[PDB]
């Protein structure tokens, strides 16, 4: 059983932006970064345990890294997955 | 004026894809030659 440690690694970081702020104040939902796989069930369990909050539903999407032109060279950013988590009437963070 | 190249990902992969080369020994030699030359792209990868 590695479910506990798995839940401690799916979550990577919160997402800060205008869309994130308006979603939180209006829809009571938090947007955060997750691992590349990060199935919806794992994200739901991780938020319930680590943040000790009740959740309703999770929506995930994959963001493709942009292609950047650094110096004389061309590079690409890494793809990452962000999840929208909808909390219930009781919210903490 | 219709030109010779009409792109299609499915046709490109099924014709010159990695698995297409490995099916026959001639394709395997094509991969072997390009590994020896050190080419970054072994085949047309989606």
């Amino acid at each position: 059983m590695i479910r506990e440690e798995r839940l401690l690694k799916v979550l990577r970081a919160p997402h800060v932006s205008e869309k994130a702020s308006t979603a939180m104040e209006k829809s009571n939902t938090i947007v955060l970064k997750v691992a590349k796989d990060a199935t919806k069930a794992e994200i739901k369990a991780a938020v319930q345990k680590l943040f000790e909050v009740e959740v309703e539903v999770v929506n995930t999407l994959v963001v493709k890294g942009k292609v950047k032109r650094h110096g004389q060279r061309i590079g690409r950013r890494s793809d990452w997955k962000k999840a929208y988590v909808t909390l219930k009437e009781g919210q903490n963070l | 004026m219709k030109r010779t190249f009409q792109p299609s990902v499915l046709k490109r992969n099924r014709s010159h894809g990695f698995r297409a080369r490995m099916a026959t020994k001639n394709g395997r030699q094509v991969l072997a030659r390009r590994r020896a030359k050190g080419r970054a792209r072994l085949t047309v990868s989606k």
């Binding site: 493709k64 292609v67 690409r76 | 990868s45 989606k46």
Partner: peptide, 13 residues
């Protein structure tokens, strides 16, 4: 560099 995910996204006509 190479993107490998040309999945189909057909919006309902």
């Amino acid at each position: 560099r190479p993107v490998y995910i040309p999945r189909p996204r057909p919006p309902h006509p």
